[PDB]
Amino acid sequence: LTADPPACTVPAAGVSSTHKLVNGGAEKIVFKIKSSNNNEYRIAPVFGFVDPSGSKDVVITRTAGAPKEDKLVVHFASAPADATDAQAAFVAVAPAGTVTIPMSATA
């Protein structure tokens, strides 16, 4: 599971950044995203799936605030049987791993 790009850099005054989650594994993955800063950041989507050899776009929207270093943590796990919506399914699965995307809001 990779993220292209693996790091985020946005203007502290405001902006948007798109990262493509890539699953090079042989099974579908379910993921949940948590931000270290829910004040100046909005993440879309927070829950989702990434198919084998497939990808999922995650948009990071930044609003005005003080420059600062933050982190976007992506918790993931094997997607269960026939889950159709990640959030519902994430309710019964314990994450298997996490990848962190740093977010640098600069002046």
UniProtKB/Swiss-Prot annotation:
It comes from the Eukaryota. InterPro entries: Ig-like_fold (IPR013783), MSP_dom (IPR000535), PapD-like_sf (IPR008962), Sperm-specific_class_P (IPR051774). Monomer. The lineage of its organism: Eukaryota, Metazoa, Ecdysozoa, Nematoda, Chromadorea. It comes from Caenorhabditis elegans. Expressed at higher level in testis. Residues 1-107 form the MSP domain. Pfam families: Motile_Sperm. GO terms for molecular function: protein homodimerization activity. This is Sperm-specific class P protein 19.
